[PDB]
Curated annotation (Swiss-Prot), chain A:
Name of the protein in question: Fanconi anemia group A protein
Subcellular localization, as worded in the UniProt entry: Nucleus; Cytoplasm
Associated disorder: Fanconi anemia, complementation group A: A disorder affecting all bone marrow elements and resulting in anemia, leukopenia and thrombopenia. It is associated with cardiac, renal and limb malformations, dermal pigmentary changes, and a predisposition to the development of malignancies. At the cellular level it is associated with hypersensitivity to DNA-damaging agents, chromosomal instability (increased chromosome breakage) and defective DNA repair.
Residue ranges of the motif Nuclear localization signal: 1-16
Functional note: DNA repair protein that may operate in a postreplication repair or a cell cycle checkpoint function. May be involved in interstrand DNA cross-link repair and in the maintenance of normal chromosome stability.
PTM annotation, UniProt: Phosphorylation is required for the formation of the nuclear complex. Not phosphorylated in cells derived from groups A, B, C, E, F, G, and H.
Record organism: Homo sapiens (Human)
Lineage top rank: taxon: Eukaryota
SUBUNIT field: Belongs to the multisubunit FA complex composed of FANCA, FANCB, FANCC, FANCE, FANCF, FANCG, FANCL/PHF9 and FANCM. The complex is not found in FA patients. In complex with FANCF, FANCG and FANCL, but not with FANCC, nor FANCE, interacts with HES1; this interaction may be essential for the stability and nuclear localization of FA core complex proteins. The complex with FANCC and FANCG may also include EIF2AK2 and HSP70. Interacts with FAAP20/C1orf86; interaction is direct.
Gene coding for it: FANCA
UniProtKB/Swiss-Prot annotation, chain B:
Entire protein: shown range: 242 to 329 of 859
Subunit structure: Belongs to the multisubunit FA complex composed of FANCA, FANCB, FANCC, FANCE, FANCF, FANCG, FANCL/PHF9 and FANCM. The complex is not found in FA patients.
Disease connection: Fanconi anemia complementation group B: A disorder affecting all bone marrow elements and resulting in anemia, leukopenia and thrombopenia. It is associated with cardiac, renal and limb malformations, dermal pigmentary changes, and a predisposition to the development of malignancies. At the cellular level it is associated with hypersensitivity to DNA-damaging agents, chromosomal instability (increased chromosome breakage) and defective DNA repair. Some severe FANCB cases manifest features of VACTERL syndrome with hydrocephalus.
Domain of life of the organism encoding this protein: Eukaryota
Localization: Nucleus
Protein's name according to its UniProt entry: Fanconi anemia group B protein
Purpose of the protein: DNA repair protein required for FANCD2 ubiquitination.
Species name: Homo sapiens (Human)
UniProtKB/Swiss-Prot annotation, chain C:
Tissue: Highly expressed in testis and thymus. Found in lymphoblasts.
Known outcome of mutating residue 361 to A: No effect on BRCA2-, FANCA-, FANCF-, nor XRCC3-binding
Record protein name field: Fanconi anemia group G protein
Keywords noted in UniProt: Cytoplasm, Disease variant, DNA damage, DNA repair, Fanconi anemia, Nucleus, Phosphoprotein, Repeat, TPR repeat
Name of encoding gene: FANCG
Entire-sequence positions represented here: 12 to 462 of 622
Taxonomy of the source species: Eukaryota, Metazoa, Chordata, Craniata, Vertebrata
Amino acid sequence: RRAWAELLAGRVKREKYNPERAQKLKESAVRLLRSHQDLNALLLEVEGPVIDCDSSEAYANHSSSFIGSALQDQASRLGVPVGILSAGMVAS
Amino acid sequence: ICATEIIKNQLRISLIALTRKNQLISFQNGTPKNVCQLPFGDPCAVQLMDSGGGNLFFVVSFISNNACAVWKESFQVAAKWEKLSLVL
Amino acid sequence: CLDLWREKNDRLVRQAKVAQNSGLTLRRQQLAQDALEGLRGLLHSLQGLPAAVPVLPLELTVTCNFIILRASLAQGFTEDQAQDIQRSLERVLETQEQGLRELWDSVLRASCLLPELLSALHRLVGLQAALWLSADRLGDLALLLETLNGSQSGASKDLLLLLKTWSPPAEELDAPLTLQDAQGLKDVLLTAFAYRQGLQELITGNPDKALSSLHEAASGLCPRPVLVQVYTALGSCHRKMGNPQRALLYLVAALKEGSAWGPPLLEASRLYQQLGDTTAELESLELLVEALNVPAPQFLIEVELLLPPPDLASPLHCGTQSQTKHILASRCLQTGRAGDAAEHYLDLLALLLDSSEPRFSPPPSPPGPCMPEVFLEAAVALIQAGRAQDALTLCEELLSRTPLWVSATHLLQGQA
């Protein structure tokens, strides 16, 4: 009975989520699924066996518009938004 | 037959029929309205019970020695008795 | 007379649609069930005459509306509607016995005689095939559609080729109304059949055939809950092939488009288990726990009629908060965060025992581990935490309430 009184838990019982909590949850879930995401691995999976050299194909030119169209082509292949390719390549 | 009115030389009857297919039909100038489906097979005759304010029933007899009382207002079975040597 | 019946049909269809669009939880069902019994009575009135070539166009249309509305309201088919279809077909034949298969063969030969009711028949085939796809009669479905198209298409034992090959015959000219039409049914058939073919091939272990049919789900009618489920299903396919980065794509898409993000967070937990990302796995399950706290139909055949209930083996099975909180605490304890695991276990066990007043926390059945095994896992976590007095109280409680589990009880009582 003292055993029971020591066992009796509290913040066990929880009810409904404020509908903004659903979006926060889903936000943090997509954040998590992208944090453990990698593009190198994607380029080894979809395309068969990354730097500006990769997308521009072996030091062709250094023209800004040319490199933009290369990122568009790459992103079209992988189904990733162009932003994240740009980010990954630049950080590498 | 339930009612007979006379617009001109012609005339206008509201008449109940019933069928080989266990159906009860209303008619007004030969306009079919308010069909019911009878439980039992091979109906024989129908009579009419008033029974108070507006609770009008068509009582249908069968060759199967059974009988239904269907509402008027809502062509809809109210009772289904059986064995019924006779009905009055 | 046909005038009046037709008018009645039209009136009732329009009433149904009005309840579909407008209305409350109560009033919707009221007008629907009202129209429903209108249609019954009309059926019976029409079923009260012999044959009538000119009536059949309605009879078939009306029985279609009746079946549709019946099924829609019930949120499922029955065999009553099989017999409704059987009756209408018997009637079609009686114009000019054994079973549905011979009936349909004779009926479709009698349609190649060109009575102009094909726009109803094809609808009726749609409905028949919806019954056989809910009741798993895919071989007879194939046979029917093989008979419908040229039987020269006999070796095409793929359904998802026959269903595409199957051509509804008209634009559905000024005939009686309908709640649905041949194409509006065929487009639900293709998606439901392809979705089902995909899930069978996945669980059966061919996540190479799956991807074809699971993209054929999204390339045609796909209500958005059908697309969320197609995406979790592709996450599973790619994880089983060893492409976790592609699986992540489709699960993120399912998170975004869904208000139902159970089946994706579960696929993610399994993915992080496959890789070893144990902290991430336990975070994905914490979020699933939080996602299962937070929680309309149409007088019309949708696609959520012709899906099954998920198997336990499927990627689309999600348990209860309790079942999954146990998965979290189990998977936390095996990893060696006994403190976290123990906390989770006490917050599980209080939810099962202290729950008399609120709605009863879900309890595991034969597949689920027996209650005493849960007490044991709880005491083990407690010990690993260094909560020995609490483990003692647990074991004492269990033995006071009531073999191997008793001997083990004494064991853990000792280690405490």
